Paper text:
Retinoid-related orphan receptor gamma (RORγ) is a transcription factor belonging to a sub-family of nuclear receptors that includes two closely related members RORα and RORβ. The nuclear hormone receptor RORγ regulates transcriptional genes involved in the production of the pro-inflammatory interleukin IL-17 which has been linked to autoimmune diseases such as rheumatoid arthritis, multiple sclerosis and inflammatory bowel disease. This transcriptional activity of RORγ is modulated through a protein-protein interaction involving the activation function 2 (AF2) helix on the ligand binding domain of RORγ and a conserved LXXLL helix motif on coactivator proteins. The conformation of the AF2 helix can be modulated through targeted ligands which bind the LBS and increase the binding of the coactivator protein (agonists) or disrupt binding (inverse agonists) thereby enhancing or inhibiting transcription.
Residue numbers in the entry: 269 to 487
Write the structure that this text describes.
């Protein structure tokens, strides 16, 4: 029952989203003032990474629970669980970020309120921030429903092509169930057209590269 697979993906996503959609949208009005901006800009490059590293660690814990509730994930062998979360958790965080992005004025939700890329100057990788803003922007352009994003993020996480799986047959099968769930849910509702506008897979991996490995220094 593929429909059960959908229903679970959707339910867990609802349960693990970490920030509800209605509060992200209600909070689009609370925008950081120039003094709050400055305030973040004057932090040290250490402090700012400590800070965002915490948040990224928290968000990662939610994705872990998303898979923990994913029907057929816990079936998988412990090794494969770890490989898939290691290689995909961060990619899913970044896709989940597009909910908290507002394309009307190019701001993101960060620590209670909304602001632009200027907020993150103290990280010192303005190129990378501009890229994270771009990517969210073109992702928000799909106007995904909650159900779409749930199924999407599940495929981001269940990819049998990840270097280092033991039971590569068992993941292909889950990946393949999800593909059919997703493609069929899209076609049933005439949303098929969004498949063309999905980011190319390299783009995600690119974006989730070295700048975010080795963050134990910040713990
Ligand atoms: C630059 C470091 N970094 C990243 O590089 C990825 C690819 C994980 C995406 O952006 C991030 C977001 C976050 N955060 C939250 C979380 F947990 F949802 F990820 S966060 O600190 O709240 C945050 C939100 C939005 C932006 C644009 C940035 C730079 C940070 C932390 C680190 C990163």
């Amino acid at each position: 029952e593929i429909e059960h697979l959908v229903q679970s993906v959707c339910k867990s996503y609802r349960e693990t989203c970490q920030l509800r959609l209605e509060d992200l949208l209600r909070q689009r009005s609370n925008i950081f003032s120039r003094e709050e901006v400055t305030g973040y800009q004057r932090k040290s490059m250490w402090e700012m990474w400590e800070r965002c590293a915490h948040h990224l660690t928290e968000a990662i814990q939610y994705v872990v629970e998303f898979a923990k509730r994913l029907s057929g994930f816990m079936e998988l062998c412990q090794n494969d669980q770890i490989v898939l979360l290691k290689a995909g958790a961060m990619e899913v965080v970044l896709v989940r970020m597009c909910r908290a992005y507002n394309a009307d004025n190019r701001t993101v939700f960060f620590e209670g309120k909304y602001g632009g890329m200027e907020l993150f100057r103290a990280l010192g990788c303005s190129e990378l921030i501009s890229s994270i803003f771009d990517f969210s922007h073109s992702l928000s352009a799909l106007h995904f429903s909650e159900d779409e994003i749930a199924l999407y993020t599940a495929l981001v996480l269940i990819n049998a092509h990840r270097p280092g799986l033991q039971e590569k047959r068992k993941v292909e099968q889950l990946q393949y169930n999800l593909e059919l769930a997703f493609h069929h849910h899209l076609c049933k509702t005439h949303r098929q057209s969004i498949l063309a506008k999905l980011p190319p897979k390299g783009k995600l991996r690119s974006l989730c590269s070295q700048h975010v490995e080795r963050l134990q220094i910040f713990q």
